[PDB]
Design an enzyme around this catalytic site. Structure first.
Site, PDB file in Angstrom:
ATOM      1  CD  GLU A  13      18.241   7.291   3.109  1.00  0.00           C
ATOM      2  OE1 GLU A  13      18.219   6.439   4.018  1.00  0.00           O
ATOM      3  OE2 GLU A  13      18.345   8.518   3.337  1.00  0.00           O
ATOM      4  CG  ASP A  65       9.183   4.655   3.128  1.00  0.00           C
ATOM      5  OD1 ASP A  65       9.178   3.585   2.475  1.00  0.00           O
ATOM      6  OD2 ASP A  65       8.826   5.756   2.641  1.00  0.00           O
ATOM      7  CG  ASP A  67       6.465   3.856   6.636  1.00  0.00           C
ATOM      8  OD1 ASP A  67       7.110   4.744   6.026  1.00  0.00           O
ATOM      9  OD2 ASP A  67       5.941   2.878   6.046  1.00  0.00           O
ATOM     10  CG  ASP A  69      14.005  -1.633   5.877  1.00  0.00           C
ATOM     11  OD1 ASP A  69      15.059  -1.705   5.212  1.00  0.00           O
ATOM     12  OD2 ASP A  69      12.987  -2.314   5.625  1.00  0.00           O
TER      13      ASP A  69
END
Lengths: 185, 185
Positions: A13, A65, A67, A69
Protein backbone atom coordinates in the site's frame (compact mmCIF):
# COMPACT_ATOMS: atom_id res chain seq x y z
CA UNK A 1 7.31 -23.06 -8.16
CA UNK A 2 4.30 -20.76 -8.08
CA UNK A 3 1.70 -23.31 -6.91
CA UNK A 4 -1.43 -21.87 -5.16
CA UNK A 5 -0.71 -23.34 -1.72
CA UNK A 6 2.98 -22.37 -1.98
CA UNK A 7 2.60 -18.76 -3.12
CA UNK A 8 1.69 -15.39 -1.60
CA UNK A 9 0.16 -12.13 -2.83
CA UNK A 10 1.73 -9.06 -1.24
CA UNK A 11 -0.24 -5.85 -1.33
CA UNK A 12 2.15 -2.93 -0.97
CA UNK A 13 0.00 0.00 0.00
CA UNK A 14 1.98 2.88 -1.42
CA UNK A 15 1.07 6.47 -2.24
CA UNK A 16 8.52 -19.42 -2.11
CA UNK A 17 6.51 -17.60 -4.78
CA UNK A 18 5.63 -14.05 -3.90
CA UNK A 19 3.53 -11.90 -6.18
CA UNK A 20 3.39 -8.16 -5.56
CA UNK A 21 0.56 -5.77 -6.41
CA UNK A 22 0.19 -2.13 -5.37
CA UNK A 23 -2.77 -0.24 -3.88
CA UNK A 24 -2.65 3.53 -3.48
CA UNK A 25 -4.56 5.84 -1.12
CA UNK A 26 -7.88 6.75 -2.78
CA UNK A 27 -17.84 2.23 -2.39
CA UNK A 28 -17.38 1.95 -6.15
CA UNK A 29 -13.67 1.32 -5.49
CA UNK A 30 -14.31 -2.15 -6.96
CA UNK A 31 -13.88 -0.30 -10.25
CA UNK A 32 -10.45 1.08 -9.36
CA UNK A 33 -8.08 -0.85 -11.66
CA UNK A 34 -5.64 -1.65 -8.83
CA UNK A 35 -8.44 -3.11 -6.70
CA UNK A 36 -9.78 -5.16 -9.60
CA UNK A 37 -6.28 -6.48 -10.14
CA UNK A 38 -5.89 -7.54 -6.52
CA UNK A 39 -9.39 -8.97 -6.58
CA UNK A 40 -8.86 -10.70 -9.91
CA UNK A 41 -5.45 -12.03 -8.86
CA UNK A 42 -6.94 -13.79 -5.81
CA UNK A 43 -9.10 -15.77 -8.25
CA UNK A 44 -11.84 -16.59 -5.72
CA UNK A 45 -14.52 -14.40 -7.18
CA UNK A 46 -16.54 -12.04 -4.98
CA UNK A 47 -19.73 -11.70 -2.89
CA UNK A 48 -22.11 -14.59 -3.75
CA UNK A 49 -19.67 -16.06 -6.26
CA UNK A 50 -16.87 -16.31 -3.69
CA UNK A 51 -15.23 -19.69 -4.02
CA UNK A 52 -12.47 -20.59 -1.56
CA UNK A 53 -11.73 -23.36 -4.02
CA UNK A 54 -10.31 -20.95 -6.56
CA UNK A 55 -8.01 -19.06 -4.17
CA UNK A 56 -4.67 -18.76 -5.88
CA UNK A 57 -2.63 -17.49 -2.94
CA UNK A 58 -2.10 -19.27 0.34
CA UNK A 59 -1.20 -16.01 2.09
CA UNK A 60 -2.40 -12.48 1.42
CA UNK A 61 0.11 -10.15 3.12
CA UNK A 62 -0.79 -6.45 3.34
CA UNK A 63 2.16 -4.08 3.64
CA UNK A 64 1.91 -0.49 4.77
CA UNK A 65 3.04 2.01 7.39
CA UNK A 66 1.48 1.70 10.86
CA UNK A 67 3.04 5.13 11.47
CA UNK A 68 1.48 7.12 8.63
CA UNK A 69 -2.03 8.16 7.54
CA UNK A 70 -4.13 5.60 9.34
CA UNK A 71 -3.65 2.85 6.83
CA UNK A 72 -6.71 4.43 5.21
CA UNK A 73 -5.95 1.85 2.52
CA UNK A 74 -5.07 -0.94 4.93
CA UNK A 75 -8.44 -0.27 6.54
CA UNK A 76 -10.01 0.20 3.11
CA UNK A 77 -8.64 -3.07 1.71
CA UNK A 78 -9.38 -4.92 4.94
CA UNK A 79 -13.02 -3.85 4.84
CA UNK A 80 -13.21 -4.87 1.15
CA UNK A 81 -12.02 -8.39 2.09
CA UNK A 82 -14.30 -8.54 5.15
CA UNK A 83 -17.51 -7.78 3.25
CA UNK A 84 -16.82 -9.34 -0.19
CA UNK A 85 -14.38 -12.14 0.57
CA UNK A 86 -14.66 -12.64 4.33
CA UNK A 87 -13.81 -16.35 4.25
CA UNK A 88 -10.33 -15.27 3.21
CA UNK A 89 -10.01 -13.55 6.60
CA UNK A 90 -11.80 -16.27 8.62
CA UNK A 91 -9.65 -19.07 7.27
CA UNK A 92 -6.59 -17.07 8.30
CA UNK A 93 -5.22 -16.11 4.90
CA UNK A 94 -4.86 -12.36 5.44
CA UNK A 95 -1.79 -10.86 7.13
CA UNK A 96 0.07 -7.64 7.96
CA UNK A 97 3.77 -7.28 7.28
CA UNK A 98 5.57 -4.96 9.64
CA UNK A 99 8.38 -3.17 7.76
CA UNK A 100 11.60 -2.57 9.71
CA UNK A 101 11.62 0.65 11.74
CA UNK A 102 15.37 0.83 12.24
CA UNK A 103 18.63 -0.01 10.56
CA UNK A 104 21.56 -0.42 12.93
CA UNK A 105 24.57 0.46 10.79
CA UNK A 106 27.23 -1.56 12.61
CA UNK A 107 30.72 -0.25 11.79
CA UNK A 108 31.96 -3.52 10.35
CA UNK A 109 29.20 -6.11 10.52
CA UNK A 110 26.22 -6.56 8.26
CA UNK A 111 23.59 -4.03 9.40
CA UNK A 112 20.71 -5.23 11.53
CA UNK A 113 17.09 -4.27 11.48
CA UNK A 114 14.72 -3.77 14.36
CA UNK A 115 10.90 -3.69 13.99
CA UNK A 116 10.18 -2.22 17.43
CA UNK A 117 11.91 0.24 19.76
CA UNK A 118 12.53 -2.58 22.21
CA UNK A 119 14.22 -4.79 19.61
CA UNK A 120 16.43 -1.81 18.80
CA UNK A 121 17.80 -1.16 22.31
CA UNK A 122 18.44 -4.88 22.79
CA UNK A 123 20.19 -5.39 19.46
CA UNK A 124 22.28 -2.26 20.10
CA UNK A 125 23.05 -3.55 23.62
CA UNK A 126 23.84 -7.00 22.22
CA UNK A 127 26.07 -5.72 19.44
CA UNK A 128 27.96 -3.29 21.68
CA UNK A 129 28.49 -5.67 24.61
CA UNK A 130 29.59 -8.13 21.92
CA UNK A 131 32.43 -5.95 20.64
CA UNK A 132 30.75 -4.26 17.68
CA UNK A 133 31.13 -0.53 17.08
CA UNK A 134 28.56 1.94 15.81
CA UNK A 135 28.63 5.69 15.22
CA UNK A 136 26.56 7.46 17.86
CA UNK A 137 25.20 10.19 15.54
CA UNK A 138 24.04 8.59 12.31
CA UNK A 139 24.54 4.97 13.24
CA UNK A 140 20.83 4.25 13.73
CA UNK A 141 18.60 5.10 10.76
CA UNK A 142 14.99 5.79 11.67
CA UNK A 143 13.03 4.81 8.54
CA UNK A 144 10.41 7.51 8.15
CA UNK A 145 7.88 5.82 5.89
CA UNK A 146 8.70 2.67 3.92
CA UNK A 147 9.92 1.83 0.42
CA UNK A 148 12.15 4.90 0.74
CA UNK A 149 14.56 2.42 2.24
CA UNK A 150 16.17 0.26 -0.43
CA UNK A 151 15.26 -2.65 -2.66
CA UNK A 152 16.54 -5.78 -0.87
CA UNK A 153 16.51 -3.91 2.43
CA UNK A 154 12.85 -4.06 1.59
CA UNK A 155 13.16 -7.57 0.27
CA UNK A 156 15.52 -9.34 2.71
CA UNK A 157 13.67 -7.43 5.35
CA UNK A 158 9.98 -8.02 4.52
CA UNK A 159 9.79 -10.70 1.78
CA UNK A 160 12.29 -13.04 3.48
CA UNK A 161 9.99 -15.63 5.22
CA UNK A 162 12.73 -16.25 7.80
CA UNK A 163 13.49 -12.74 9.02
CA UNK A 164 10.13 -11.12 8.12
CA UNK A 165 7.71 -10.19 10.87
CA UNK A 166 4.12 -11.26 10.10
CA UNK A 167 0.98 -10.80 12.18
CA UNK A 168 -2.21 -12.52 11.05
CA UNK A 169 -5.48 -10.63 10.64
CA UNK A 170 -8.30 -11.98 12.81
CA UNK A 171 -12.03 -11.50 12.21
CA UNK A 172 -11.94 -9.12 15.18
CA UNK A 173 -9.09 -7.22 13.51
CA UNK A 174 -11.14 -7.00 10.29
CA UNK A 175 -14.30 -5.95 12.11
CA UNK A 176 -12.60 -2.83 13.52
CA UNK A 177 -11.29 -1.97 10.07
CA UNK A 178 -14.88 -2.15 8.88
CA UNK A 179 -16.13 0.10 11.68
CA UNK A 180 -13.35 2.64 11.27
CA UNK A 181 -14.15 2.73 7.57
CA UNK A 182 -17.83 3.22 8.32
CA UNK A 183 -17.04 5.98 10.83
CA UNK A 184 -14.69 7.70 8.38
CA UNK A 185 -17.91 8.43 6.45
CA UNK B 1 6.97 5.12 -4.52
CA UNK B 2 4.80 3.05 -6.85
CA UNK B 3 4.06 5.74 -9.47
CA UNK B 4 3.10 4.48 -12.99
CA UNK B 5 6.20 5.78 -14.79
CA UNK B 6 8.46 4.55 -11.95
CA UNK B 7 7.12 1.02 -11.55
CA UNK B 8 7.35 -2.31 -13.35
CA UNK B 9 5.18 -5.40 -13.73
CA UNK B 10 7.18 -8.63 -13.76
CA UNK B 11 5.53 -11.69 -15.24
CA UNK B 12 7.20 -14.79 -13.85
CA UNK B 13 6.22 -17.59 -16.16
CA UNK B 14 6.33 -20.57 -13.84
CA UNK B 15 4.85 -24.05 -14.07
CA UNK B 16 11.94 1.22 -7.91
CA UNK B 17 8.49 -0.37 -7.60
CA UNK B 18 8.26 -3.88 -8.95
CA UNK B 19 5.00 -5.78 -8.97
CA UNK B 20 5.09 -9.53 -9.64
CA UNK B 21 2.36 -11.68 -11.18
CA UNK B 22 2.60 -15.31 -12.28
CA UNK B 23 1.55 -17.02 -15.52
CA UNK B 24 1.64 -20.81 -15.82
CA UNK B 25 1.88 -23.05 -18.90
CA UNK B 26 -1.66 -23.65 -20.20
CA UNK B 27 -7.84 -18.41 -27.58
CA UNK B 28 -10.24 -18.05 -24.66
CA UNK B 29 -7.19 -17.72 -22.39
CA UNK B 30 -8.42 -14.17 -21.74
CA UNK B 31 -10.67 -15.93 -19.23
CA UNK B 32 -7.78 -17.59 -17.38
CA UNK B 33 -7.70 -15.75 -14.03
CA UNK B 34 -3.92 -15.24 -14.18
CA UNK B 35 -4.18 -13.65 -17.62
CA UNK B 36 -7.05 -11.42 -16.53
CA UNK B 37 -4.96 -10.35 -13.58
CA UNK B 38 -1.99 -9.45 -15.75
CA UNK B 39 -4.31 -7.76 -18.20
CA UNK B 40 -6.25 -5.94 -15.49
CA UNK B 41 -3.07 -4.91 -13.69
CA UNK B 42 -1.72 -3.14 -16.81
CA UNK B 43 -4.82 -0.93 -16.65
CA UNK B 44 -4.80 0.01 -20.35
CA UNK B 45 -7.85 -1.95 -21.36
CA UNK B 46 -7.79 -4.21 -24.42
CA UNK B 47 -8.48 -4.39 -28.17
CA UNK B 48 -10.50 -1.30 -29.24
CA UNK B 49 -10.57 0.05 -25.69
CA UNK B 50 -6.77 0.03 -25.40
CA UNK B 51 -5.64 3.30 -23.88
CA UNK B 52 -1.90 3.90 -23.51
CA UNK B 53 -2.99 6.69 -21.21
CA UNK B 54 -4.05 4.26 -18.52
CA UNK B 55 -0.87 2.14 -18.54
CA UNK B 56 0.13 1.65 -14.94
CA UNK B 57 3.58 0.14 -15.52
CA UNK B 58 6.44 1.78 -17.32
CA UNK B 59 8.10 -1.58 -17.98
CA UNK B 60 6.56 -4.99 -18.51
CA UNK B 61 9.32 -7.56 -17.91
CA UNK B 62 8.59 -11.19 -18.85
CA UNK B 63 10.67 -13.78 -16.96
CA UNK B 64 11.03 -17.38 -18.04
CA UNK B 65 13.53 -20.04 -19.08
CA UNK B 66 15.01 -19.74 -22.59
CA UNK B 67 16.26 -23.29 -21.99
CA UNK B 68 12.99 -25.06 -21.24
CA UNK B 69 9.72 -25.81 -23.08
CA UNK B 70 9.79 -23.16 -25.75
CA UNK B 71 8.50 -20.37 -23.60
CA UNK B 72 5.12 -21.67 -24.77
CA UNK B 73 3.86 -19.07 -22.29
CA UNK B 74 6.42 -16.43 -23.22
CA UNK B 75 5.24 -16.91 -26.79
CA UNK B 76 1.64 -17.13 -25.60
CA UNK B 77 1.80 -13.94 -23.53
CA UNK B 78 3.77 -12.14 -26.23
CA UNK B 79 1.14 -12.95 -28.83
CA UNK B 80 -1.58 -11.80 -26.40
CA UNK B 81 0.17 -8.41 -26.08
CA UNK B 82 0.84 -8.18 -29.84
CA UNK B 83 -2.80 -8.65 -30.88
CA UNK B 84 -4.70 -7.03 -27.99
CA UNK B 85 -2.28 -4.46 -26.64
CA UNK B 86 0.29 -4.05 -29.40
CA UNK B 87 1.09 -0.41 -28.61
CA UNK B 88 2.64 -1.71 -25.39
CA UNK B 89 5.17 -3.55 -27.55
CA UNK B 90 5.62 -0.76 -30.14
CA UNK B 91 6.34 1.91 -27.56
CA UNK B 92 9.03 -0.34 -26.10
CA UNK B 93 7.41 -1.29 -22.81
CA UNK B 94 7.80 -5.07 -23.04
CA UNK B 95 11.01 -6.85 -22.02
CA UNK B 96 12.63 -10.23 -21.34
CA UNK B 97 14.63 -10.82 -18.19
CA UNK B 98 17.40 -13.34 -18.56
CA UNK B 99 17.83 -15.29 -15.29
CA UNK B 100 21.39 -16.17 -14.30
CA UNK B 101 22.64 -19.45 -15.78
CA UNK B 102 25.56 -19.94 -13.41
CA UNK B 103 26.63 -19.28 -9.85
CA UNK B 104 30.38 -19.13 -9.34
CA UNK B 105 30.80 -20.18 -5.71
CA UNK B 106 34.09 -18.43 -4.95
CA UNK B 107 35.77 -19.96 -1.88
CA UNK B 108 35.83 -16.74 0.10
CA UNK B 109 34.25 -13.97 -1.94
CA UNK B 110 30.59 -13.23 -2.55
CA UNK B 111 29.44 -15.59 -5.32
CA UNK B 112 29.15 -14.27 -8.85
CA UNK B 113 26.54 -14.93 -11.47
CA UNK B 114 26.98 -15.37 -15.18
CA UNK B 115 24.10 -15.14 -17.71
CA UNK B 116 26.02 -16.68 -20.63
CA UNK B 117 28.70 -19.32 -21.06
CA UNK B 118 31.13 -16.64 -22.19
CA UNK B 119 30.54 -14.47 -19.12
CA UNK B 120 31.25 -17.58 -17.04
CA UNK B 121 34.68 -18.44 -18.48
CA UNK B 122 35.73 -14.79 -18.23
CA UNK B 123 34.56 -14.30 -14.64
CA UNK B 124 36.21 -17.60 -13.67
CA UNK B 125 39.40 -16.49 -15.47
CA UNK B 126 39.19 -13.06 -13.82
CA UNK B 127 38.58 -14.41 -10.35
CA UNK B 128 41.34 -17.03 -10.58
CA UNK B 129 43.99 -14.79 -12.14
CA UNK B 130 42.95 -12.35 -9.42
CA UNK B 131 43.81 -14.68 -6.54
CA UNK B 132 40.38 -16.14 -5.78
CA UNK B 133 39.94 -19.87 -5.22
CA UNK B 134 37.07 -22.12 -6.29
CA UNK B 135 36.42 -25.85 -5.95
CA UNK B 136 36.80 -27.53 -9.34
CA UNK B 137 33.99 -30.09 -8.81
CA UNK B 138 30.96 -28.30 -7.40
CA UNK B 139 32.21 -24.75 -7.55
CA UNK B 140 30.11 -23.77 -10.56
CA UNK B 141 26.38 -24.38 -10.17
CA UNK B 142 24.52 -24.81 -13.44
CA UNK B 143 20.98 -23.59 -12.70
CA UNK B 144 18.72 -26.08 -14.43
CA UNK B 145 15.47 -24.13 -14.66
CA UNK B 146 14.83 -21.00 -12.60
CA UNK B 147 13.17 -20.15 -9.30
CA UNK B 148 14.70 -23.38 -8.00
CA UNK B 149 17.62 -21.13 -7.20
CA UNK B 150 16.93 -19.02 -4.13
CA UNK B 151 14.89 -15.98 -3.16
CA UNK B 152 17.30 -13.02 -3.36
CA UNK B 153 19.54 -14.98 -5.71
CA UNK B 154 16.45 -14.52 -7.79
CA UNK B 155 15.95 -11.01 -6.54
CA UNK B 156 19.47 -9.51 -6.44
CA UNK B 157 19.97 -11.36 -9.66
CA UNK B 158 16.90 -10.47 -11.76
CA UNK B 159 14.98 -7.69 -9.93
CA UNK B 160 18.08 -5.59 -9.20
CA UNK B 161 17.98 -2.90 -11.98
CA UNK B 162 21.77 -2.56 -11.74
CA UNK B 163 22.91 -6.17 -12.14
CA UNK B 164 19.85 -7.50 -14.03
CA UNK B 165 20.15 -8.34 -17.70
CA UNK B 166 17.21 -7.00 -19.74
CA UNK B 167 16.56 -7.27 -23.47
CA UNK B 168 13.69 -5.29 -24.96
CA UNK B 169 11.01 -6.92 -27.10
CA UNK B 170 10.76 -5.45 -30.61
CA UNK B 171 7.74 -5.63 -32.93
CA UNK B 172 9.80 -8.10 -34.97
CA UNK B 173 10.39 -10.16 -31.81
CA UNK B 174 6.63 -10.12 -31.10
CA UNK B 175 5.71 -11.00 -34.68
CA UNK B 176 7.69 -14.27 -34.50
CA UNK B 177 6.00 -15.12 -31.21
CA UNK B 178 2.69 -14.63 -33.01
CA UNK B 179 3.70 -16.87 -35.92
CA UNK B 180 5.13 -19.60 -33.69
CA UNK B 181 1.89 -19.50 -31.74
CA UNK B 182 -0.12 -19.76 -34.94
CA UNK B 183 2.05 -22.65 -36.19
CA UNK B 184 1.74 -24.44 -32.85
CA UNK B 185 -1.91 -24.88 -33.88
Amino acid sequence: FTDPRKSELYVVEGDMFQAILPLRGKDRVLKNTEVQAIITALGTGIHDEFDIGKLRYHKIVLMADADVDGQHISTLLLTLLFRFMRPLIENGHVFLAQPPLYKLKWQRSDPEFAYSDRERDGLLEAGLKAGKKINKEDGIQRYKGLGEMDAKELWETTMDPSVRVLRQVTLDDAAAADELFSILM
